[PDB]
Design a protein around this ligand. Structure first.
Ligand SMILES: [Mg+2]
Ligand SMILES: [Mg+2]
Ligand SMILES: [Mg+2]
Ligand SMILES: [Mg+2]
Ligand SMILES: [Mg+2]
Ligand SMILES: [Mg+2]
Ligand SMILES: [Mg+2]
Ligand SMILES: [Mg+2]
Ligand SMILES: [Mg+2]
Ligand SMILES: [Mg+2]
Ligand SMILES: [Mg+2]
Ligand SMILES: [Mg+2]
Ligand SMILES: [Mg+2]
Ligand SMILES: [Mg+2]
Ligand SMILES: [Mg+2]
Ligand SMILES: [Mg+2]
Ligand SMILES: [Mg+2]
Ligand SMILES: [Mg+2]
Ligand SMILES: [Mg+2]
Ligand SMILES: [Mg+2]
Ligand SMILES: [Mg+2]
Ligand SMILES: [Mg+2]
Ligand SMILES: [Mg+2]
Ligand SMILES: [Mg+2]
Ligand SMILES: [Mg+2]
Ligand SMILES: [Mg+2]
Ligand SMILES: [Mg+2]
Ligand SMILES: [Mg+2]
Ligand SMILES: [Mg+2]
Ligand SMILES: [Mg+2]
Ligand SMILES: [Mg+2]
Ligand SMILES: [Mg+2]
Ligand SMILES: [Mg+2]
Ligand SMILES: [Mg+2]
Ligand SMILES: [Mg+2]
Ligand SMILES: [Mg+2]
Ligand SMILES: [Mg+2]
Ligand SMILES: [Mg+2]
Ligand SMILES: [Mg+2]
Ligand SMILES: [Mg+2]
Ligand SMILES: [Mg+2]
Ligand SMILES: [Mg+2]
Ligand SMILES: [Mg+2]
Ligand SMILES: [Mg+2]
Ligand SMILES: [Mg+2]
Ligand SMILES: [Mg+2]
Ligand SMILES: [Mg+2]
Ligand SMILES: [Mg+2]
Ligand SMILES: [Zn+2]
Lengths: 83, 208, 104
RNA sequence: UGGAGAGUUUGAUCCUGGCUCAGGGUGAACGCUGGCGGCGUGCCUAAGACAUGCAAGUCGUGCGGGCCGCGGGGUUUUACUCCGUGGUCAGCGGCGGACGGGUGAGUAACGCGUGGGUGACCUACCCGGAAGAGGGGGACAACCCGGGGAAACUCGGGCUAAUCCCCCAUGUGGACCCGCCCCUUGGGGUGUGUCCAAAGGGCUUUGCCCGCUUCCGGAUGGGCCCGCGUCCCAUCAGCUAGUUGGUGGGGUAAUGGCCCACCAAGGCGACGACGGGUAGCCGGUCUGAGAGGAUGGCCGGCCACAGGGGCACUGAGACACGGGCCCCACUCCUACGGGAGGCAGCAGUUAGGAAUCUUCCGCAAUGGGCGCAAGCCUGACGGAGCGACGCCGCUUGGAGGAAGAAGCCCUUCGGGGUGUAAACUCCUGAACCCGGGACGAAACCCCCGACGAGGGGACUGACGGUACCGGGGUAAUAGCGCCGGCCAACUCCGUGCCAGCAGCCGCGGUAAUACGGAGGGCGCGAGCGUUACCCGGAUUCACUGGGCGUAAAGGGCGUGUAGGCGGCCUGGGGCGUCCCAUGUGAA
């Protein structure tokens, strides 16, 4: 199935991830279906997480499955906040 | 320094006062006065009609030595000033003049750029407050260049900012001798530099 | 869009099939001038309907054989053996180009 | 924000013309030299051969067991026998092993690029919707019993569970023949007939969780087809017999000579067929003023390959690198019968070579497989290690300091040079020492809420006592090339067409700025030179952008085939050409 997961993009000791949609079977850094966010785990800037809940919600609706820290990040942007 | 070695022997090769060694270059002892010919055995001989290349070479040396920069470092700036929008001649001179090691010597924290290099490598200098020990650091406008807090009263920066009492600072820099701060207001207008060097030639050298 | 080409039938010699000759002008990548250039398609003709010389539109289509991947869509201009003849001489020439000559 | 030229044919000249230099680039290697760090990068040759270790498994919440323990029962006691529980092992079964990882050998091809087509198709796991699980039956491992082989391993007999296999039922629905309607290639309806379903498990047990069945849709991935693009040789000119097309079969998820039988005689080529050579293709890279040229190395995408050659099984997917069979070549075992292998996974060894790294740490992060979960596996990966191999930052000090030591070097014998350089005065304080010491990590999980949203909690660091912060603090590596012109930089001695230099032009035949050394000078600087290769200067294959009376170049002349090209006026079409919109042009 298609996943929502992290793609490692920074540099040696400088991790930045792209939050991506992709078939589970790509390499982690290979061709992805759509970037739908980014994550800087060092919080080196004020702007260290970013999602696009609209698209995130889209891919969930067609059954993308997010990895365990992708969903954590998605939640942190209120992808799932329903109230 | 970066060259490290006989300095006033370059004074004599370029035939112009360069002021690399600070204040003795103001004394009647700088070799340029009362020994103005190149170094070496043949330095007092009838000097041959210098080639077109020779002249563009020397003017570049004339510029690069005045800033104490290497050459790989120098070329990397000119090329950045090439690719940059604007007049590539005096966009070069602005970058050169934005080097922290030079800006410190402009604010008269040190009598020369070489002495100003050492004060930077030895953490005697703040930029905006945090230490910066990289002489190549690029000062941007708005940035405030202090003497390091715990340095402020060394025997050297004492007697050097004492000379700067009443002395005048370039148009593009402020300066505050009390707390030993200084600001970079604007990249220099080509007119502001009294540089004994036709930088038009330096462009012409790097295009053979 | 299934590609549609227009051409000249230059062969009836087959069962339920026509050779269609398709030209295309275009400017030459380096030297500018407009170069003609042509290619023969084998087209599916199930009524053995179209005849030597007919000018037909030919359409992309699901394979009928090796070679045959086009069907004859409609008839544009009926009859004109000049093109056939033009094409015919071109292959007549071929005979010359070899290792001998004379009356050959 | 874009274009520099020079040296060399002559006694001199102008032109033609080649050669050479200056510039940029590099997975480099060689020489002399070598201090720190960050980030990259590192078998170009043998797709040669490979020791050793590790590299794909997981699930007891599908099933039944063996072995080793412990505990509780039925009896008055033993014997026998029943139940519970701990460890362990494989077996049956499910999902994964078709991904990830390696390489570029082959391949000039729908292989790749690009844009389309599929009324000619598939898609496990995932999401949405509709509906469903009622009876019954069977076998094979494990285990038990025997045989055979040295071994790898193998044969026979008997027992048994299941989410293993089958039969009947239910028919939402679907499949197939025929018909009918709408569509229009095999798209979507509809009727009769026929055919087709299912599996159980766990509980904080009646109602939840995880599964199972059929169908319809989505999503992702893929098959196949087509237009157009893709190197050199014409001293390769003709090629083809499953060849080209038809009918009907077979085969497949599906179109197709894909394969087969029969029939017709086609198909292809100078717009380069057939043959030979070479090569993985692209995003991109390098160079260039551009147009071009060159290239495909890191990373990303496609393809292909897994000692060489075939092949099919299983399956959603493979004709499968760490699966199966056969043939070939090697190495190993061998009781001579027969067996065991396959680093182009990570390291590592050897061989070839001018040359290419550690048998390192860790699953903390990201990602993948299985598992409800706890977790397990992961040489993917995250790090560390070696090499100046590249890039970038940084140091070997700063300020003062003589009319100006000493040595060395010139000298017109007065002087001049190295040279503020050193010595020396003061100042700072790379190395080193002490102390604090990270970010990367908040989820899974547990509690509250409702296993939702939301809130609370706990656990976790290979790198690493590193980064960085603070306190101390020592004047602490400089090399290499060059100095006739092109090309920045000249003097002495030695040498005598020798020894030697030499990119090109040219130096050396006793006063050599060209050889060798010295002093000095120039250029770069932890690097500088050399070789090799690429583009450049090279308008020196000229499209931009050249030529052919004598420099190289008009065919000995014609005829006229293909082809190229084509006077003036009107009209239609709108292929070329131009315009707008739009889609594509991933990272
Ligand atoms: Mg001549
Ligand atoms: Mg001459
Ligand atoms: Mg001349
Ligand atoms: Mg490294
Ligand atoms: Mg190799
Ligand atoms: Mg392991
Ligand atoms: Mg047991
Ligand atoms: Mg087991
Ligand atoms: Mg070929
Ligand atoms: Mg194509
Ligand atoms: Mg469903
Ligand atoms: Mg039996
Ligand atoms: Mg079953
Ligand atoms: Mg039935
Ligand atoms: Mg090859
Ligand atoms: Mg050019
Ligand atoms: Mg091999
Ligand atoms: Mg093989
Ligand atoms: Mg399967
Ligand atoms: Mg099958
Ligand atoms: Mg396999
Ligand atoms: Mg294969
Ligand atoms: Mg292997
Ligand atoms: Mg290896
Ligand atoms: Mg060797
Ligand atoms: Mg390595
Ligand atoms: Mg994980
Ligand atoms: Mg790694
Ligand atoms: Mg934190
Ligand atoms: Mg964990
Ligand atoms: Mg000169
Ligand atoms: Mg002599
Ligand atoms: Mg000499
Ligand atoms: Mg020379
Ligand atoms: Mg450096
Ligand atoms: Mg050219
Ligand atoms: Mg040439
Ligand atoms: Mg021309
Ligand atoms: Mg010419
Ligand atoms: Mg002649
Ligand atoms: Mg001639
Ligand atoms: Mg003539
Ligand atoms: Mg002639
Ligand atoms: Mg004609
Ligand atoms: Mg005309
Ligand atoms: Mg014409
Ligand atoms: Mg048109
Ligand atoms: Mg467009
Ligand atoms: Zn001076």
């Amino acid at each position: 199935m298609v996943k929502i997961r992290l793609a490692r993009f920074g540099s040696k000791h400088n991790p930045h991830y792209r939050i991506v949609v992709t078939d589970a079977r790509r390499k982690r850094d290979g061709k992805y279906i759509e970037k739908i966010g980014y994550y800087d785990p060092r919080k080196t800037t004020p702007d260290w997480l970013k999602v696009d809940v609209e698209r995130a919600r889209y891919w969930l609706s067609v059954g993308a499955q997010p990895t365990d820290t992708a969903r954590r990040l998605l939640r942190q942007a209120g992808v799932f906040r329903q109230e | 320094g970066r060259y490290i070695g006989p300095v006033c022997r370059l004074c004599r090769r370029e035939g112009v006062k360069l002021y690399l060694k600070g204040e003795r270059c103001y004394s009647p002892k700088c070799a340029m006065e009362r020994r103005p010919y190149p170094p070496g055995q043949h330095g007092q001989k009838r000097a041959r009609r210098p080639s077109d290349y020779a002249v563009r070479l020397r003017e570049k040396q004339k510029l690069r030595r005045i800033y104490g920069i290497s050459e790989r470092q120098f070329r990397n700036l000119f090329e950045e000033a090439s690719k940059k929008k604007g007049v590539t001649g005096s966009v070069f001179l602005g970058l050169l003049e934005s080097r922290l090691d030079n800006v410190v010597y402009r604010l008269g924290f040190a009598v020369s750029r070489r002495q100003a290099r050492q004060l930077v490598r030895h953490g005697h200098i703040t930029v905006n407050g945090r230490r910066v020990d990289l002489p190549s650091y690029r000062v941007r406008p708005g940035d405030e260049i202090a003497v390091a807090e715990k340095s402020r009263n060394l025997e050297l920066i004492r007697q050097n900012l004492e000379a700067m009492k009443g002395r005048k600072v370039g148009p593009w820099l402020s300066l505050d001798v009390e707390g030993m701060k200084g600001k970079f207001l604007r990249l220099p207008d080509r007119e502001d530099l009294a540089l004994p060097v036709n930088e038009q030639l330096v462009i012409e050298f790097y295009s053979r | 869009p299934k590609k549609v080409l227009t051409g000249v039938v230059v062969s009836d010699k087959m069962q339920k099939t026509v050779t269609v000759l398709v030209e295309r002008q275009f400017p030459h990548p380096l030297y500018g001038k407009v170069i003609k250039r042509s290619k023969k398609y084998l087209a599916h003709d199930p009524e053995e309907k179209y005849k030597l010389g007919d000018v037909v539109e030919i359409i992309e289509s699901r394979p009928i054989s090796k070679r045959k991947r086009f069907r004859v869509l409609r008839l544009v201009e009926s009859g004109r053996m000049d093109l056939v003849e033009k094409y015919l001489i071109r292959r007549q020439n071929y005979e010359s180009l070899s290792k001998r000559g004379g009356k050959a």
